[PDB]
Amino acid sequence: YADSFVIRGDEVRQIAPGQTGKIADYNYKLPDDFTGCVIAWNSNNLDSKV
Amino acid sequence: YADSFVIRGDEVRQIAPGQTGKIADYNYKLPDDFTGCVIAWNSNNLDSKV
């Protein structure tokens, strides 16, 4: 399974098993026994406008 | 006459008549009787690599 989206810089730490915040409990919740990997990178120069 | 270059974000104030600094007195100097105009804009998403 591959899931993709775009979030804020601060909130990448919320994508982890057993984590609390705003995205975790309202937008994207991970299973506690999740197995797999998470990849995140910077897209400021592609998704930001003046 | 049109002159073009690229400088650090903080140095835009150094491009002014009768101004002193590092670029203002070693790379580009504006005459005290300068007439004309100056334009500066952002290139963070064009001239920056990971």
Curated annotation (Swiss-Prot), chains A, B:
Outcome of altering residue 10 to N?
In strain: Omicron/BA.2, Omicron/BA.2.12.1, Omicron/BA.2.75, Omicron/BA.4, Omicron/BA.5, Omicron/BQ.1.1, Omicron/XBB.1.5, Omicron/EG.5.1; complete loss of interaction with host integrins
Chain residue ranges for the region called Integrin-binding motif: 8-10
On assembly, the entry states: Binds to host ACE2. RBD also interacts with the N-linked glycan on 'Asn-90' of ACE2. Cleavage of S generates a polybasic C-terminal sequence on S1 that binds to host Neuropilin-1 (NRP1) and Neuropilin-2 (NRP2) receptors. Interacts with host integrin alpha-5/beta-1 (ITGA5:ITGB1) and with ACE2 in complex with integrin alpha-5/beta-1 (ITGA5:ITGB1). May interact via cytoplasmic c-terminus with M protein. May interact (via N-terminus) with host bilirubin and biliverdin, thereby preventing antibody binding to the SARS-CoV-2 spike NTD via an allosteric mechanism.
Its function? Attaches the virion to the cell membrane by interacting with host receptor, initiating the infection. The major receptor is host ACE2. When S2/S2' has been cleaved, binding to the receptor triggers direct fusion at the cell membrane. When S2/S2' has not been cleaved, binding to the receptor results in internalization of the virus by endocytosis using host TFRC and GRM2 and leading to fusion of the virion membrane with the host endosomal membrane. Alternatively, may use NRP1/NRP2 and integrin as entry receptors.
Name the chain's protein.
Answer: Spike protein S1
**What's the source species' lineage?**
Viruses, Riboviria, Orthornavirae, Pisuviricota, Pisoniviricetes
* Coverage span on the entire protein: 396 to 445 of 1273
